[PDB]
Amino acid sequence: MDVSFRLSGATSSSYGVFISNLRKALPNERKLYDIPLLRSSLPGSQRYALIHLTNYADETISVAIDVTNVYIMGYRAGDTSYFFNEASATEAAKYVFKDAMRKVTLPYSGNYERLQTAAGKIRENIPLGLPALDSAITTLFYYNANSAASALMVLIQSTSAAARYKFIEQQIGKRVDKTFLPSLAIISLANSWSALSKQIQIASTNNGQFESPVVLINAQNQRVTITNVDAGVVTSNIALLLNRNNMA
């Protein structure tokens, strides 16, 4: 099921609607502690969804995600598709954007370490917020090799990461007419998503206790060691769980 967000006329509330809609597009059979557990595996015909994004200037891209893990596989602009250079995206390309005339395989996977190398910049120095998503859409719609990695990191954080964590949703959406640099809390949450997901699943079998702690950096910049499901990150932040059988 497809989802969309339009930057023209956007508000913090319409972004909230977009992120709720994105979360709702992701299949789950169960919740653990009131958090959706994503599917471990889906047939090809069920595995992908499109996010349609339109910038201030009415230019649109379509972004393919794997709905088992929220990972961006690639995007389409007009008659050209762009996929990450990795196994998952190669498989996605058999299912989405099939009638694109030209297909570009980007020179990196969609892994953050690869992207930052490619961008020449770390996440903390790349602006986010709604106007940043507008610029990322423009940058990718008129693809330019030297600018695309930074734009894809804005895209990832503005969609996937926001869907995974209410904190990230709220921080991005608040910036309607301005931009901001993500705090270490945003970096830390994004870094730890797989690990936190794994530990919450283990917790379900271990009376709410993690088997291994997750070190996070909180909104006050304190470094914290999280050990169970009564932690605020679990009660009041994470919004999706990566299935333990879809990690490695």
Ligand X SMILES: Nc1ncnc2[nH]cnc12
Q: Which residues bind ligand X (CB under 6 A)?
A: 70-72, 110-112, 156, 160
Q: Which is nearer to ligand X, 53 or 229 (CB)?
A: 53
Q: Which is nearer to ligand X, 203 or 214 (CB)?
A: 214
CA pair distance 81, 61, nearest whole angstrom: 10
Q: Which is nearer to ligand X, 55 or 158 (CB)?
A: 158
Q: Which is nearer to ligand X, 72 or 233 (CB)?
A: 72
Q: Which residues contact 97 (CB under 8 A, 6 or more apart)?
A: 62, 64, 74, 76, 81, 103
> Would you call 149 helix, strand, or coil by DSSP?
helix
Q: 209 with 203: CB under 8 angstroms?
A: yes
CB of 91 to ligand X, least distance (A): 14
Where helices occur in 165-207 by DSSP H, the ranges are 166-174, 184-203
CA pair distance 218, 216, nearest whole angstrom: 6
> φ and ψ at 53, to 5 degrees?
-120, 135
CA pair distance 179, 194, nearest whole angstrom: 27
CB of 135 to ligand X, least distance (A): 19
Q: Which is nearer to ligand X, 57 or 247 (CB)?
A: 247
Q: Which residues contact 61 (CB under 8 A, 6 or more apart)?
A: 52, 53, 75, 76, 77, 137, 140, 141
CB of 190 to ligand X, least distance (A): 6
CB of 112 to ligand X, least distance (A): 5
Closest residue to ligand X: CB criterion: 110
Q: Which is nearer to ligand X, 15 or 71 (CB)?
A: 71
